[PDB]
């Protein structure tokens, strides 16, 4: 029968590792780097677009940074198509919670459920896992500003600063060096851009190969604002820190 | 070789190896004999134990008042198939007030076994059956093979060393077919038949199993001290 | 539906997928359970290749199943969430129908049954998780500590450890734990637990978690400084 | 079932619920507690169809307790009330709807404010300073419209509640065998034993 | 390679080797034939007498579908019974909806599509039988032969099994010597002769002859077995020709 | 790979044969049937001294008149016991009587071959089912993952089975008392066990018509162990 | 509207002695004011020394007897030809009847 | 190399099972041809009956799908009949659902879509057949549309299929280069059939008796096949010129 | 029987590649060249009509397809796969948008739905990925004109101009030299014809080239009058004659 052609995507190696999860992580390590940095007064999300062409429409484009609700965003590393499947599920899940309890969903609860979906694809169903790692940036009134990451295994962890995708080893060492707890958003913006600039596989970091976003309480009084940066705004912030 | 992974695969010479391997399980089973006259049909079965502390595996099963079988091979598979026969005999009685013809019983077993030889995931049944019965056309004896092949016979035997009894019955054909209106003599002929398949062991009181059905006799099984008469 | 029998017997009579799930447990961070005269203590290793962690929000290693029972584990973290969720749901379901919280034995028996089911169901792999389940039965002061594993077998332990280098810490506990006289107090029990982890861990800084469960739903997690005092005290007695 | 009342004052929510369980021409019990604690600072009283009431109450209780254990956190009274409303709003278009009316009294620890929600079996939710289900409201609402002030103490609320029970004991046709009174505030839930 | 390990897989030739392997199982089976005649069809088959213990006349191999169609087959006997069971279901549903008994060409395609369906997936095995069948309908007599692939055609005469080539040669002589047509009673006699002649390819065990027929005049358009005097007469005709 | 329900060329089911190897790795369980009762005994075999041995549960009640001992992958036995208990209680509900021991065993054995591509694999545990009914008296059955069950006068299963069975062949007779059977299980368990037999690493049980199925205390077994050692020294 | 029930009349009677028991019933079968049969037996030997009658709506009565007779047959098949005691028969018949609690057999039953 | 057993991509982006299904197309060793007139569409195919025991009237690869649509198949008969039954059912359902007769090109697209599914879904093999659909469509006029195991389909001025298809194709190309038009400029279908047989004779280089050919003709409101004597009448007309 | 293939046929290899997706992209590389260029007041999509036989009528085979009145699509790779995707794409524009909001979806969202369908063929049981890359051009009120590429993986990217298939590498370089942000629609059509001539070998005329635009509303192509707000489709397929007119002033 069809047994002959079954890859057995949800089995253990003799060493107790999940083949497909390991190979999905190997895939993600070639995707453009994405960095998240959590400050005391906000969060920065920075991501490098995968080798751009000059005829790509840059302003009407979205590849790395997606909005889940008004208080939560994600940076993506891996297959974009796989990520959008999961993003739409996450968007719906947030609305289900809001409909049920009349309160915006706590960040961890959303992260756990999305991570639980990934876990399922590694234990049952015989399907390939999602080749995606997320950086979650969000705010709620319990824990305030929060950064999380999840990967194809469905395992998630919380961070002060973290990178996913390419050159995470080098990126993490640089973040570990210059990060401190009393840091402000504008300092974190600078650290994020400086780290990408040193870890990039490109010749020089320019506005057209970046996506940028902040989550501040820099609205007017006790409320949170999501700012997905426009091309010209990335061009300005790159000049303001003296990278170009 | 490369064509015995499942029942759904033919070999290059047109063989079904899984069905043949199922047939092999019958050959390892303990010998059982079947024979009939015009008035009665008799099953004789050699029972097998695990050791001297164990019981002797029962070989004969009743299906209705007028029908029953003996088994050789995987016993759980015989339980599944006998249960199916019990239901089919029963359906015929409840719906049509009709005793199931021994021939139809054979056709039904054939078709049930066949379906397990043409689909992925399943396996063939690993047991052979000898069905005896008395219906509106007199006494009958059938031989079931898990390939699906069912055959009506005057007498036969299946299991290990069944060839000895099968040869004997082939010689005795003209004698035992005319043992009409005499149960004890038809059994004696069956007990002598199964004796041609014995090696180093002889028929004892908790070793021998005999069943009979006929004109004025419901399907009944004899074990223990009730078979001492025939040793 | 995906049907494949993934857990099957091999010629020598082993189920390799279950045995490989045990290897995932062996890779996981060390977890230890020690029960005293009036308490149970659950200790857990946390690897230190991860700096820049946020410990406020990162999932804790010991989870409350109900107000009176806790569950720690070794192995795949994602797998453990599924077992914890099911256990928490069964806890509330038991309270609803029996009008009494679960016993620790019952909660363990349920979790072990779930694990076993995933070893002979089509289309699923076994859980890469072994658990330590500790607590006190309703209106009872006798300490309870149970262990489960991927195969589905479970049993009660005076003290037990699971995870990487668990054979080293089990060795320690086997000569340092007296059945005739279990740690008489909370302090004694926490110390023996911290000592056993220090055989394997590295630094007694933000690498060790300790959770103490006492009778009648009395569960509290120790902070860094509180644990660090045990680490400091043990090292000074060692230099002798 | 029958009489359930609620009053929200300055610092607490007070729920009063009748003690009688009547079937046919017999009062089977006179000490029935028509309430369930959903969380440490949230209490729900209920009235309606026999069987349905307790079954629904305990089902909600199980779900909120499950949430508490999962998140190691207590849901706000507003959040709990919305969850309960949705369950009843689902129920009303089921094959057999829950015929249960509830009041939810809670103290929001994040806001430091008492909150009282009235929800009927259709899933009709309103936040109120005072509430009642069934025929009780036909006497108590007008009474409370007159005597209630928003800045009252817990003691003033209990006296205001005594005035309601007295009116019901005078003008209601059925003997409801008094009420069990419970207070919800910053320190949780407690029962008044002498009412 | 490995193209022959799974059903429904095309080889680089464009062949389904599993079906060709099922054909080998058919070639291993006993001989069965079909002769089309003036106003009907005749079917005959070789029954190998394995032992003295086989009850004569009591292991019937030819099968009736509805009341007007006969079916015989060579190869795996259980597979043939499965095909006839389906045929009976198909014929019953046709008569249910359309009232009239199923026409032979209509019935032929029902079996054809069903056998063809067992070459479409790797989760089923092809049929290990070639089936000769036919009968009488409103448009007269029809004879068909269906193979494991699902392929079928109409036939003047048909043969399959271990002695198919011997039987085919003998069938071709009848077609050449009788251009106007063969009578039903003659075709019964000829069927006996051809089975006896085809038995030379299976001559270790001696055999038992079984014949059936449908004829507009002789059997009133219904399927009947040939028994007693008409059978013995046909056996004697065959015995005289081999000597 | 290959189908789960595949036959070998010798006419045996691969998975069933492989599960029989798993049972050989299991701890020893012995049963002896007398006219005064049936005795069931097992080796506990704790993997570590810190493990509390009384939590090891390898002898189990099915009903008041039926008990059960296990050997092999013991986690697999839970659903078998659950089924057995439900079958026993259900029969009492439907027929207001005790269910025959043989009928119980047949019901458990019906689960066995319900695997394939139903559960994904056969059970990796063998069961000794002991009980009493009015028709056939005291009975002992050996239930395998093949779906087959034999009645036994005495039977051993597990790692020390073939050596223990040969010993049971010599010792068993049709006039054994219950006390004689108890000692005989202890004697044969002590022979095949790795560690030295005591009340903490071995467990006894019996089923009698009068008192039903009982698991013995560690105190009661300890005295039978002492009575056994004294009798072997006495000649 | 179609009414699935009817009334076939008749009456039955059971008495028990020290070492015997009788089950009697008239042989008349009716609908409305007409006689269907003067001799239609409704007391049956079900095997194992159990006699049974299900009186009321004859279609339901026959169906029940038919199902119980069949229950006796399968009791033998499943429990080594063991005799079905009268108390066990009674309990079995309860489950036959209650199984159709929401579409009842319209009969009084005596064994 | 299990990528050659089921319909998944090979490293070079190919589907071998689809390619091998194309080779099954020529297993019958029969050539077919289709042309268009002013008022009609003619399709012809070789008829080879090797066995003397066969009933020649039952040997056919041309099918009447509906009253207006005809279909000739190149490939084994089991798959051919499978395709024919489905096409008949599809055409019947279309008429019931949408109130008008299914056009030839729409049926072609539908059957091509079904074929495409077998190239993408693993459990279903492709049918080893090429289907040529013919009609006189009420909107588009004379129509020839052809389907293959890849799920490809297109309309044709004329077409040919089989082992010696290329010879017939170029023969037709060279005629339409000469005539400068999209069809056979002829009034009657009889002479369009004669054209079809004539150009098949020239391309294949063989002579045909009445039993070596099979002819289907589509006119307004009906498609029909010709008898042996209808073809014989047509063969005589060619010979006498 | 029944689909026993409930498992993924596309899986990760040790190196992290998804084999079947890579191999699908290889099939797209073999496919005939197609391109798209975005102007200030419109979008053009073009491709070569590779005829299988000169007896075949290449008008009956449409490579450029209308999806909505304001959205069109062209492809490179496997034709049959494209055909069924167009069927599914047309339907999903109705079921998941028009039947809900009473208007046609914006380009980016229809593209998003097609991408989803292609992603699922990469993960679901018993299927291979689609062997095509799509170029989708369209207009909507709030986003204006846009051009998208969709790959076998399900990924999509917005483009000012691009090419896919056989000679895409050279064609992209050609478009980089010629494209500016002030191009008028007629200038973009001119550049599209120039770029395509490089990759086409045989005949280069209106019968071998297929070309459509997304531009001004066409009231004459609406089929009815009387509703002021309905002004006609922005999608228009250029005729064989209209192409030849522009090939003289080339
Ligand atoms: Cl379609």
UniProtKB/Swiss-Prot annotation, chain A:
Swiss-Prot/TrEMBL keywords: Cytoplasm, Isopeptide bond, Nucleus, Proteasome, Ubl conjugation
Pfam families: Proteasome (PF00227), Proteasome_A_N (PF10584)
SUPFAM superfamilies: N-terminal nucleophile aminohydrolases (Ntn hydrolases)
PROSITE patterns membership: PROTEASOME_ALPHA_1, PROTEASOME_ALPHA_2
Subcellular location: Cytoplasm; Nucleus
Location (main, coarse): cytoplasm
Residue(s) of cross-link: Glycyl lysine isopeptide (Lys-Gly) (interchain with G-Cter in ubiquitin): 99, 198, 230
One term under GO cellular component: proteasome storage granule
Any one of the GO BP annotations: proteasomal ubiquitin-independent protein catabolic process
InterPro entries: Ntn_hydrolases_N (IPR029055), Proteasome_alpha (IPR050115), Proteasome_alpha-type (IPR023332), Proteasome_asu_N (IPR000426), Proteasome_bsu_CS (IPR016050), Proteasome_sua/b (IPR001353)
Complexes and interactors: The 26S proteasome consists of a 20S proteasome core and two 19S regulatory subunits. The 20S proteasome core is composed of 28 subunits that are arranged in four stacked rings, resulting in a barrel-shaped structure. The two end rings are each formed by seven alpha subunits, and the two central rings are each formed by seven beta subunits. The catalytic chamber with the active sites is on the inside of the barrel.
Family, similarity comment: Belongs to the peptidase T1A family.
Further remark: Present with 17100 molecules/cell in log phase SD medium.
The protein, known as: Proteasome subunit alpha type-3
Native source organism of the sequence: Saccharomyces cerevisiae (strain ATCC 204508 / S288c)
From Swiss-Prot, chain D:
One of the GO biological process terms: proteasome-mediated ubiquitin-dependent protein catabolic process
Superkingdom, taxonomy of origin: Eukaryota
PTM sites of type Phosphoserine: 76
Coarse class of the protein's main subcellular location: cytoplasm
Location of this chain's protein in the cell: Cytoplasm; Nucleus
InterPro entries documented for this protein: Ntn_hydrolases_N (IPR029055), Proteasome_beta2 (IPR035206), Proteasome_bsu_CS (IPR016050), Proteasome_sua/b (IPR001353), Proteasome_suB-type (IPR023333)
Gene Ontology molecular function: endopeptidase activator activity
Keyword RNA-binding: no
Positions where N-acetylmethionine occurs in the chain: 1
GO cellular component, one term: proteasome complex
UniProt xrefs under PROSITE patterns: PROTEASOME_BETA_1, PROTEASOME_BETA_2
Note: Present with 21800 molecules/cell in log phase SD medium.
Self-association and partners: The 26S proteasome consists of a 20S proteasome core and two 19S regulatory subunits. The 20S proteasome core is composed of 28 subunits that are arranged in four stacked rings, resulting in a barrel-shaped structure. The two end rings are each formed by seven alpha subunits, and the two central rings are each formed by seven beta subunits. The catalytic chamber with the active sites is on the inside of the barrel.
Family per record: Belongs to the peptidase T1B family.
Protein's name in the database: Proteasome subunit beta type-4
GN (gene name): PRE1
Swiss-Prot record, chain G:
Entry superkingdom: Eukaryota
Cell compartments where the protein resides: Cytoplasm; Nucleus
Entry coiled-coil feature ranges: none
Function per UniProt: Non-catalytic component of the proteasome which degrades poly-ubiquitinated proteins in the cytoplasm and in the nucleus. It is essential for the regulated turnover of proteins and for the removal of misfolded proteins. The proteasome is a multicatalytic proteinase complex that is characterized by its ability to cleave peptides with Arg, Phe, Tyr, Leu, and Glu adjacent to the leaving group at neutral or slightly basic pH. It has an ATP-dependent proteolytic activity.
Oligomer and partners: The 26S proteasome consists of a 20S proteasome core and two 19S regulatory subunits. The 20S proteasome core is composed of 28 subunits that are arranged in four stacked rings, resulting in a barrel-shaped structure. The two end rings are each formed by seven alpha subunits, and the two central rings are each formed by seven beta subunits. The catalytic chamber with the active sites is on the inside of the barrel.
Protein family: Belongs to the peptidase T1B family.
Protein name per UniProt: Proteasome subunit beta type-6
Species assigned in the record: Saccharomyces cerevisiae (strain ATCC 204508 / S288c)
Gene behind this protein: PRE7
Residues shown, of full length: 20 to 130 of 241
UniProtKB/Swiss-Prot annotation, chain H:
A Pfam cross-reference name: Proteasome
PTM-bearing positions, type Phosphoserine: 227
UniProt-annotated location(s): Cytoplasm; Nucleus
One GO-annotated biological process of the protein: proteasomal ubiquitin-independent protein catabolic process
Keyword Nucleus in annotation: yes
CDD domains xref list: proteasome_alpha_type_6
Domain of life: Eukaryota
Keyword set, alphabetical order: Acetylation, Cytoplasm, Isopeptide bond, Nucleus, Phosphoprotein, Proteasome, Ubl conjugation
Disulfide bonds: none
GO CC annotation: mitochondrion; nucleus; proteasome complex; proteasome core complex, alpha-subunit complex
Cross-link Glycyl lysine isopeptide (Lys-Gly) (interchain with G-Cter in ubiquitin): where in chain: 222
Main localization, broad class: cytoplasm
SUPFAM superfamilies named in the record: N-terminal nucleophile aminohydrolases (Ntn hydrolases) (SSF56235)
Primary role: The proteasome degrades poly-ubiquitinated proteins in the cytoplasm and in the nucleus. It is essential for the regulated turnover of proteins and for the removal of misfolded proteins. The proteasome is a multicatalytic proteinase complex that is characterized by its ability to cleave peptides with Arg, Phe, Tyr, Leu, and Glu adjacent to the leaving group at neutral or slightly basic pH. It has an ATP-dependent proteolytic activity.
Other comments on record: Present with 15200 molecules/cell in log phase SD medium.
Entry's family note: Belongs to the peptidase T1A family.
Name of the protein: Proteasome subunit alpha type-1
